[PDB]
């Protein structure tokens, strides 16, 4: 049955003010959304009780950590929209196992950095949205500049919000020349 913090149809569940990721979402749902949620963390294997998800949305939440393998066990997931959240930390293997993922959004989360190889193995990606963040253009972001240069995925123009000498520079236009790290 539909969890009380959710509203469900046959195909879809929309959860609001959830205090934890519910483990009782009906296992046949193919799209799941969390809005204004109470939980602060997304630990490994959080969605194993809904293995048939094709779409996941997180919007207007506050997260302390999205952990390694948060989205593991979801081999059919094609759309993952993580937008308009406060997110303190995302991990290197947060998106591990998402071989079918077509479109990832990390838009409007005021992210200051992204860990190296965060998109490793996302071989089905045609779209990634990175706008509306606050990236610091330092050595920790060097990998992203290289990734933007080699990916076939469509990615919008995004801009450094720091350090001050880099502010408003288009990240897509940077080179590894722009970074001399050790």
Curated annotation (Swiss-Prot):
Induction / repression: Down-regulated in neuroblastoma cells.
| Tissue expression pattern | Predominantly expressed in neural tissues, especially in brain. Expression is reduced in low-grade brain tumors and significantly reduced or absent in malignant gliomas.
Mark the LRR repeats by their residue spans. Answer: 52-73, 76-97, 100-121
Q: What keywords are annotated for this sequence in UniProt?
A: Cytoplasm, Disease variant, Endoplasmic reticulum, Epilepsy, Glycoprotein, Golgi apparatus, Leucine-rich repeat, Repeat, Secreted, Signal, Synapse
Name the GO cellular-component terms: axon initial segment; cytoplasm; dendrite; endoplasmic reticulum; extracellular region; extracellular space; glutamatergic synapse; Golgi apparatus
What's the domain of life for this entry? Answer: Eukaryota
Altering residue 152 to Q: what's the impact? Affects glycosylation. Loss of protein secretion
Q: What Gene Ontology biological process does one annotation of this record name?
A: positive regulation of synaptic transmission
Domain LRRNT: residue ranges: 1-32
Protein's UniProt keywords contain Protein biosynthesis: no
Q: Residue limits of the LRRCT domain? A: 133-182
* UniProt main location, coarse: secreted
Annotated glycan sites: 152
The molecular function terms in GO held by this entry are:
signaling receptor binding
How does the record describe the protein's post-translational processing? Answer: Glycosylated.
Give the location in the cell.
Secreted; Synapse; Cytoplasm
Q: How does it assemble?
A: Oligomer. Interacts with KCNA1 within a complex containing KCNA1, KCNA4 and KCNAB1. Part of a complex containing ADAM22, DLG4/PSD95 and CACNG2/Stargazin. Can bind to ADAM11 and ADAM23.
Q: What does this protein do?
A: Regulates voltage-gated potassium channels assembled from KCNA1, KCNA4 and KCNAB1. It slows down channel inactivation by precluding channel closure mediated by the KCNAB1 subunit. Ligand for ADAM22 that positively regulates synaptic transmission mediated by AMPA-type glutamate receptors. Plays a role in suppressing the production of MMP1/3 through the phosphatidylinositol 3-kinase/ERK pathway. May play a role in the control of neuroblastoma cell survival.
Medical condition linked: Epilepsy, familial temporal lobe, 1: A focal form of epilepsy characterized by recurrent seizures that arise from foci within the temporal lobe. Seizures are usually accompanied by sensory symptoms, most often auditory in nature.
What is the designated name of this protein? Leucine-rich glioma-inactivated protein 1
The primary gene name is LGI1
């Amino acid at each position: 049955k539909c969890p009380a913090v959710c509203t469900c149809t046959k195909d879809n569940a929309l959860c609001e003010n959830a205090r934890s990721i519910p483990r009782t979402v009906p296992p046949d749902v193919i799209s799941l959304s969390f809005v204004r949620s109470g939980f602060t963390e997304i630990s490994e294997g959080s969605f194993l009780f809904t293995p048939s998800l094709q779409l996941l949305l997180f919007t207007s939440n506050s997260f302390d950590v999205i952990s390694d393998d948060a989205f593991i066990g979801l081999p059919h997931l094609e759309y993952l929209f993580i937008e308009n959240n406060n997110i303190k930390s995302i991990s290197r293997h947060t998106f591990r196992g998402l071989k079918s993922l077509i479109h990832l959004s990390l838009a409007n989360n005021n992210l200051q950095t992204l860990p190296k190889d965060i998109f490793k193995g996302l071989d089905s990606l045609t779209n990634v949205d990175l706008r509306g963040n606050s990236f610091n253009c330092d050595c920790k972001l060097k990998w992203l500049v290289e990734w933007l240069g080699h990916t076939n995925a469509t990615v919008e123009d995004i801009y450094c919000e720091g350090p001050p000498e880099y502010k408003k520079r288009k990240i897509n236009s940077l080179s590894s020349k722009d970074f001399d790290c050790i």
